[model samples]
Target chain A: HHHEPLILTAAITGAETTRADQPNLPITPEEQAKEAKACFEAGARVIHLHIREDDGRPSQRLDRFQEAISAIREVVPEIIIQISTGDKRLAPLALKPEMATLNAGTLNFGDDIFINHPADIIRLAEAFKQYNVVPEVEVYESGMVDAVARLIKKGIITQNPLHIQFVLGVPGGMSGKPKNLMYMMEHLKEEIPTATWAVAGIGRWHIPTSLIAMVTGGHIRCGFEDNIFYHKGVIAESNAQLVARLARIAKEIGRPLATPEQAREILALN
Target chain B: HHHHEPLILTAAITGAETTRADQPNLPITPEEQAKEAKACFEAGARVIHLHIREDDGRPSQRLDRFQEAISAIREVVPEIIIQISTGGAVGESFDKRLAPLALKPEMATLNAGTLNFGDDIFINHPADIIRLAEAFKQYNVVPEVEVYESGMVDAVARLIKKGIITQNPLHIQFVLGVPGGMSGKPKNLMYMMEHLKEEIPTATWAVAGIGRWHIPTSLIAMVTGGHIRCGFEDNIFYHKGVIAESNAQLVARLARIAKEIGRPLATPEQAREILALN
Candidate 1:
């Protein structure tokens, strides 16, 4: 169980949970670029980049996404860049990405009128293919595998060997726990046995997500774009703190760190 | 608008679990039997599965004991489904497993197949299971089939083919997270369900998970539209360390889950209908 640090993805800025929610949230490109550079300096290897509009609202702005990606690339060109498309609430489903963020399936989210439609999901995958953007399959449940399979059948998301991220512990999502983690890994092994997988735990889910990443032999993603604090009521000065902590835990558990190139090779980033 | 859980009233008052050794909470006698029965019944248990013990904590078949418990229990609630155990531990052999069936319980469990019983001792010899199942048929008791391993469904199907189980809506228990059985998870539960449809289309199943699985299994079962079982036979610890005030507390939690999930506790009569006891 030689634990290694997983590829750390730092979300620069999100549409919701903006500075109004937390005054320190970086919004403007100057802010995004500065913060992204700071996160890279803190040891983040993958930037799970998000873009905000001129008014600091969540946007499908290709120009904004392009600016954010380009600015981050200036400092961390080698860092794996993943764009967000699952943010369908604020942006049009048509918000194509420089890199596609695939919402692998439909699920009921929030209180009311928040549904991830299956057709909308396919549109995003199609956008991924049309734009030559890599699809980072975001999964909240294993049933999403059914959607992924459907896409592969239609040649929307080619599936020789699948690449998926088991996003854990969202409200209305699978609770992050050790047993559930093991069960998730078992089914993934049984059903899509040849697929490559990774993990992203939301909010307080970070702890168990990292642990599951350790035991399940999956890659790891971290950053404020996912969670803001190291613990409740305590902000992590930078995204690097979380990644460094993940790196430490991985080493403690015997999972070796996935180098940038190694992560690329593992995720089919070729 | 809060993230809610599930409700499932699981009470395993009579287990092949501990004796007078562990704690006073574990029920063992016919006297304690009526008491625990009424407690869970009051606590909202629609189905109560049990394993009786002699004065010495060894397994007992004395019909007098069953009559004693059942009669006193009926005085309180005649409608709660009564499921007796055919567990191998109480009796080493298959024939012995059906000893309690002589009492003609409304339902008696028939372990689907066999697997490692404990951490190191797994066993599910088909001959023993088939013969024991035959006894269940002779007794006319509804068989609550339990499958620790997924393939056990095939063995259960075989019994149906042999006419040992004639019921149309079969009752099965998916016993997960035990040493050599299916590990507990919503996914495996689905896989097992798919497998069950293929092998035993007529079967209706509940989940009986052990140890750390008790609460989560109940939640998953409730959420996924399955039934569940809970008691000291499975876990000695309640919450963290406080010994369960009673299996009754677990039932209360189950009741709360039911309401939160919009699946309120099934009434005793509802349970009877579901298990086809009528």
Candidate 2:
């Protein structure tokens, strides 16, 4: 395996999770700043941020996101702040976040439908350009990888050597099994060879997907946002707890965690 | 690589698309659909996947329309397996889409998951998928599970794992060349087939290449032991820039190719046993 520093991303508060389910899921801006600080100290260089309303519902307001970003930047200035584009409120061009996610295609999101039509995908790609924001493309399926290549060929997304996150094991998406991961990685390498990749295994898939990432030299994204439980029935104490385990695994496998600055360059943030 | 098994060619005569503007030979009415079925049956297509249309040539989910079309085809080609279209035009309600399944066709299409179908969204939510699977079981219908992309195949495998679509040795149709779906390349077909074999070793499959991908995909599936789906529903051309005269014209090409490769075209009864419809 390559001795290059591994990038660890901490997705502290997601769009759907709540503190009720995992008591230590950081919700408020202050709590999020604290969680980001702890995760950064735990060897994570990126914070995938999703703000929640005071009542713990997923919020799409700019003020809530602004406050969270400001608080995290104030506390953990070294860690790159990544706002999610799953919510449409925080325009990447207006807020000018260091990083944001661009979902590559559509999927049936559990009971509801997650709509990312071709037009919407194109619009978001243009916004990423106008805003000068680096995008971490979220591929929920193999065809989504094709969709990204189409965008690149169409000149909508001009990012060379792109970044991608294989968010696997969703109800209507691909599984988190090693075969699926290997299959998706093969697709990525075949379609977009210059791109770097990471894996976010939903729920119980977090551990196995992360272990694969560690040995394969891909990045790892883990937190209460994706997985509230540390294991079966055990609620995670904090998002940093999950980040620390991945960091430990990375080190054990000789793929040490990336420093915040190294992560910035690895992600083309610099 | 497997030898001696006959190739089952499915003629998707008239899908939800294939407008009269481009494909004038597309069957629109019951009479035309039956006529097309008879020709395709003679051309070695054992199963006819139907997407019925109203008298005006627009896509229709009406049960009577399906029945009339089904009756006309059965009158001419009695032994042909009638596979109704559960996946109607894009944006059709899941309720209206499932209405055709009540007609009790021997086989019907089960779209595995939601897809960006061309410019429009083909909304098949997870709950609705489970609903359709239950209805298929209740109606005693076999599902020709339709997959446009790899995740859709994984989604189908998950259904098989959960016993939702409980048909063992499931029949999957790999649809290629939708604008928002996977491209019609041999690599994609090979990968999807490999992934499917890994997930469900017993499942049988077919390939329907949309537009220009039709011939290449048909050739690839022919050698891979997968079945073939042809006709105006997936393609309008017999060769570069030349319009196919009928769905029968398309089936004839595949039948000839199977013959050249020493793979015998399946008969209607052999198709029944191979597809588990018997």
Candidate 3:
């Protein structure tokens, strides 16, 4: 009838955002290194990462990621850091952070008014599992549950608990509603009985979508990687504040936020 | 510093949903019916839809509610595209369902498929919808195809292929976020769009999202060059937990989002061209 709470992941810094968007937007590699530590220290047990260049551009160059990862580990060494599978924006999918991507099917993403699809999404997925990295299947559409099922059937994702992240409210992607969340989860449960699922809600819909997932036995991710506002038309001060609110909501919903070690156990981390 | 957002809306004067738990502002009486439509059109909606009720709790196709609403509405807005719903809130038979639609407004909802179509639960069966495509042939009203699931699009396509509903410029509404309908995923929404493109090329479409879907799915339709329908019938509030005083507030919100993204509002004339209302 019930299960453990939804995991909150604070994505401290991402590939496309800048310091100007918000004063708290971490800009330098040094800042990101510290932000990573701070984010993990917050209720965020996992950091969905995207390393950037020195001047705030998304660094496709592997050396920048290597430097960022090393600097971050120097502080919070045991933090579970999973990189973005760059195929979402650019070709070769590995252009940024140049190390890893997700293993699975391609998905559609609608940010603001933009519609995005990567033709090489499957190729990018293959690269992730080949390197022993966990593929956080990012789906903006409900059929993506079918895609993950297909991936597992192909032996690409080798694990007991399948980790899937449902992205809600990309303007052009899934419209945020508990009704939609319920159907997608039901589909996953009926179809992908062998795997596990989570949610990655974006923009204004993130909080409510996360609540439905939390109430219905699912994991979650949050922070600036998905939204700029704490509430409607209100700017979030920092990733800490955003994660803090998520923690509070979890508490209100009768569940506590999961720790990094607990998150790994829930998501089946290596 | 910037121009105002476009306010294009179609108000549902009454809905089959008599549930009082959702909102208290929902109109029931004939006088209240016309007053609500006037309030919405005053707020900026150029089109209004019709749903009738006997009492609030019981679902009914009472033609009196329909006649009362229409006579009240037409006096205020002369050029409005007034649509009447053929959908029975519960499981009314196809004959009973389309009976209320027989009043023959300029536009009528031709819900294309049987889907689990509610917020808290799902409803709809094949027998409940089997006589629709055949019966729609007797009326001159434009069928606003309501698509909840992807498979419904194919069934609609089959209906189109059968020549039951003549296709000049086809019309459809992709219903998203209905717990009884399609999920709110953009990929699945696009899949439905692509399915429409592949099957019915000359089709014009809009999006109707339920509950919290008001902003996101409406924006999806606007950004993707599609029309949208919103009001207290689909979304009761301007934002989370706020019931709008009128449907205009929600339409104004749509105009704001459209303006934010550099999209111009479609005039009723422009909407007609896009939706084949001409």
Candidate 4:
């Protein structure tokens, strides 16, 4: 019941999705930058970038990331650029992103295993610390929070007011339900009370998760990365359509929407 | 807020991890396991979770090995319930793990979900889990759903909803304090208990603290209306840095705690009724 300015993150694309999966998914740097502009104007302050090659396959090349970051910066200069580092390992740090993903633990992602071994996680956290990069630590289960707390104790992750993003409903991970979300939130409160949090509910869970985050004063991460359809089966026109709906709801509920400047301040990017 | 129900204490005679290197006194053979089970049964344990081994003392899942162990234990004490381990050391396939259900022991452990066991991954795929549940039904074996985290309980509940786990009063074991699984802290056990109470209202539970948490978890489970699981499998140490005298000594400690609090220990027959054993 705490009312705070909402900082919406529009995860434009992800490593898993392809143009074949969702036709509206932005693949090229130009299309991503255009979508970033629309989303920034619609109310999102952060564009979580997962770059793709020109032929529409997921890419981890530095040139591709640079082009996308440059293109997005030219169009939406104030939008906070957050890169996903699940696949590329520590290479994403070279992009000097305002934020990047630091997956909390090993998990079964969809049909495959997302192997984030403890030693590998520690190496990534050390890199993030060396680069002074703010991590949007992704937690798929409650036990992962304890795993991350171990890092904090070892002095690897020195960020104050840590930011964590709970990704729910992955086939092999924690399911996206109110009980699971509440479990993670309570675990965070007890383990790391100063942490800022967001929820990225997968597929059909996006709406309810966003609403729960909205009411609970947690931030929201939405877009094609998490969902392809705006409603029942209707493909979303763009990421902005999803952001606009969340913006509208936030406005109607009296929770203030943070502008780019406020979001930057809140995230310590300023 | 609840009255005392009969406490069904379980003695998990020797796990895959305990060996001569660490816990040298652990039971390593069918005769040894039978002897250990006899001691624990005499001390107050109503159930014994079994993990058999080769002649050289290596953990084994062979049907003959299981038969040898089960027979030896039954010869020693005919009334005690024998629960086999489906999670026989890591790296074994689901098919190999399922081979033991043919013996149709009274109860067997059904690990409900996957876990990152320390640096290693205890690979329990979702399809394998449902397959194991179906095998349990096919063999008429009551499953002690081994839960390592909150998600495992939810997964068990899903199996229940899908009619795979059709047993009423589903017996669940919370195996806490492993490196990758949930820590064996008081908060985690409490959370899992509350979640189990909500997710499966009729579920019966037992708590097994992995190492140092054995005493705390056993004591907590006593007042919470849940049962207790202890032995060399979970804890080889009776106290800090001291090797346990025997599995019976561990169960006897819990039985002592339960008695001091005025809760009576369940006999082998009472345990059969409590666990719905046929």
Candidate 5:
């Protein structure tokens, strides 16, 4: 397992995080670009991007995404930018980033319903194909894994050796327990054996989920988008601070971090 | 480990979708349901999971119809606990679903989260769930939290922590084998039981296997000291491609199997004690 290089992703800004909660959260395009450079230097080969307005509200405007993409590319041209297809749906797919997210099923997201109907999911997959962008399938529950497998059989998702992101610890979704992570991996292997996967443990689930992914030879995703706390009751200085810790931990465990080019090969990004 | 708790069998006589066309013996009217409840009770069911339909076989959430059904069942089988279905037809209004709780039988089902049910999505919004939890408290009705997926178990655990669901030793029913919901395979059932035990240790649980899942879920629950629920609501066939003669027939098979395994059936008093229903 140590033979495979670890791909660490830094999700600089999420759609839901507020500056009041994490004072260092990057909202402006420049802030995001600078953070991407720091994270790249700290050992993150991929940047899971969720752009926000100047006021810190989440936005889906294509122009904002383009600005952020261009800024980040200017600062760190080697890093992979994977935009979120959540709030804006498929609009960002038109920007044609290296990669984007595809949520597998509908689930109760905190107080609201994240309505990803079957038809909508199929449509999004088709759009990804049309725009020629790679998708990191987001799975919040176990059934969603099977749902994705059915799509693959039906040929709606044609990505070979697909990448899946097991997103845990949302209010109404699966919690980030070690057993759950293990169960999800095994379930995925049975359903889609060739798929490469990663874990994004939300809120307090960051440490355990990261460590488990590290030893299991899977990938890790970290930043303010998933967690604001560096330690218990401690706010992280920046997204780089989170990425730096994961990079160090992987080094100590004898698992080498993947470089930008290696990450592209691992994720099969064009 | 050898000494297990008495097995509690719940017969869901009529569900929202199980029609006479599917099972000729489906009990729709209050009198038909009452007769089926008595037969199920005699066949070793201590609980009747109730769902009412109009005389013409249309699903009805009318309060009077629920009252009539409850009254008829109570008149004939007073000992059997009546657990009403707060889940009406998949698309029923949330208000109509909650209105039946005012009648407040011994127990009612509370769906924990939303998921795709068949071709349509089963919408159980978070706010609506909180409101329904409050309604359960107002009516003093104990909820048998219906969990279709593993995440719902965690969701209910959050409710317990927030003091929204105040029932001590709360009961949960794992409704499995819907097309879009989790399947009732052995590994799935085992994983669910372990997950529930870890999340809410003190909570009791049962399994309602739909369609072909009936055999696997029943045998697993029987051996594991968990409870079982069966009838037209979950499964109408006694065997593959064979429609069941009556709901009581299904209950009798479970009772006979328990007897063969030397697992005693829980009497009405024992079931009441196990479920913490006074």
Candidate 6:
């Protein structure tokens, strides 16, 4: 496990994050491209992307995703770019980068309900195949993992060696407690034995979840999209600052960081 | 430790979904429910979780129907506690669901969160949950907080912190095995109990395993000192391929298992005390 190279993914900008919250959040394609370069240099192999307009409002425009992907590729051609598939935001799948997220089930997101009906989930899985894009299945609850397993059995999700991202610690979703991570891992092993996995612990869960993944041979995802604070009550200088710490920790634990080429092979991306 | 606490069995006589065509013995009328209640009490059930239905088997929330059902159950088994279901069919209106608490039948359920229930989602909005909690206080009714997923337990804990759910030694019922909700696997049940102990240390809990989860959830709850809920509401099958003769048949098996394990069944008074009912 110690010898397994860690694949670090940096979620540079999220749909819900604002410049007011982090002040350093990247909004334009140039800003995102610069941040992706810094993150790649700091040991992040993948960039989990979400585009924003000049005013920091989230946009579903495919051209915005194309601009961001093009800018990031120009800066770091080797870095893997994965797009988000949130509700009406599925238009970005048309650009179809290396990979995209497929949220497995529905749950309450904070005060609002995040609905991913069973039919909608199937539709998204089919679209992923139509675009010839690999899906990084996002599981927020326990039943969702089983739901994804059922889908695989039903031939809805055909991506072999699937990658699952356990996005934990949302207000209305599962927390990233150590026991929960361990339980999710064991549950995933039992449900989909051939799957690869990562963890993105939101808000205050960022540190503990990162360390657990560091030690357990699981991949790690970090950036403003998940957590704004570099420390308690302190803001992060940049997304690279968060990725740098994970890289340093992996080095300290004798686990090497995954290179872009290695991450692609590990995630089974073409 | 298991033998120290008496096992409390709750019989769900007629659920919103159980049909006469599926289980011929499902009690629908007030008189039939009263007869089933008496039989369940005789078979060692201390509580009857009630859900009323129209003569044609459609789920009902009319105040008079609930009153007649409660009155009939009271006449037959005056000692047993009656807990009404706020969760009528998944599609039932929240107003009608909350209307039954006004009857104040000792106890009523408060579904903690919303989830996808089979094809439709069981909608329990955050603001609605607060309103329901306030209604329980207004009616002086004890609440059996029903949790389907882990986050619901956390949501209830948040409500308690905000002084919304002020009941002390609160009782939580883990309703597991819905298609879109959590399952009643052994490891899952064990994890939920441990998680509850951490989140709400003073809370007492019970398990209602739906369908095939009936046996595993019952056996686990029996050995772990947690309470057990059985009847046609959760599971209609007595075994793999056999339909249960009556709700009493389900309750009787749990009572026999408790006897074999040397765990005494909680009496009506003991259950009242454990549940913190007036």
DockQ of each: 0.05, 0.01, 0.04, 0.01, 0.01, 0.01
Per-residue C-alpha lDDT of model 4 across residues B1-278, encoded as one tens digit per residue: 12157999899998887777888788989999999999999888999998888878777888898899999999999989999995566555557788889999999988888888878887778998888889999999999889999998888989999999999988999998888999765557667888999999999999999987775566557656778899988889876677888898888777665554456898888899889996
Q: How far is candidate 6 from the true structure (C-alpha RMSD, Å)?
A: 20.1
After superposition, the stretches of candidate 1 with alpha carbons farther than 4 Å from their true spots are A1-270, B1-8, B86-102, B119-125, B185-187, B240-242
In terms of docking quality, how is candidate 2 classified?
incorrect
On residues A1-270, what C-alpha lDDT tens digit does candidate 5 reach at each position? 433699999998989999999999999999999999999999999999998889998888888999999999998999998988673467767766989889899999999998889998999898898889998999999999999999999999999989999999999899886667878888999999999999999977776567557656789899999999876677999999899887765654356899777899889985
Question: Per-residue lDDT of A1-270 in model 3, one digit per residue for the tens?
Answer: 013655777777765566777668775668877777777666777777787666677765666666766776778776677676453333323322312435343434443332224335556556665555556766777666776677567775555676777777766567656557767877888868866776777776665566456556677777787787766667788887777766654553246667667777777774
Tell me the whole-model lDDT of each prediction, alpha carbons only: 0.67, 0.82, 0.64, 0.83, 0.87, 0.87
Docking class of predicted structure 6: incorrect
Candidate 5 ranges with C-alpha deviation above 4 Å: A1-270, B1-3
Candidate 2's residue-wise lDDT over B1-278, tens digit each? 33236899999998887899998887899999999999999999999999988888878888888889999999999999999985556445568777877788999888888888777887778988898899999988999998898898888878878888889879999999989899776557778888899888899999999987785567557655779898888889876677889999888877765654356888888899888996
Q: Which stretches of candidate 2 lie over 4 Å from their true place?
A: A1-270, B90-93
True contacts kept of each: 0.00, 0.00, 0.00, 0.00, 0.00, 0.00
TM-score of each: 0.55, 0.51, 0.51, 0.51, 0.52, 0.52
Q: Of the pair 4 and 5, which is ahead by lDDT? A: 5
lDDT of 1 at A126: 65
Better of 1 and 4 by lDDT: 4
Model 1 preserves the real interface contacts to a fraction of 0.00
Candidate 1 second chain TM: 0.87
Kindly list the per-residue Cα lDDT of model 6 for residues B169-278, writing each as its tens digit. 99999999988999987667778988999999999999999987777677667656789999998899886678999899889888875664356899888999999996
Distance from true position, residue A103, model 2, in Å?
50
Q: What is the RMSD, in Å, between candidate 3 and the native fold over all Cα?
A: 10.5
lDDT of 6 at A41: 97
lDDT of candidate 4 at residue A21, scale 0 to 100: 67
Task: Give the per-residue lDDT digits (tens) of candidate 3, residues B146-202.
Answer: 788888788778777777668568787787877667765555555666688888888
What lDDT is obtained when candidate 4 is compared to the true structure? 0.83
lDDT of 3 at A188: 80
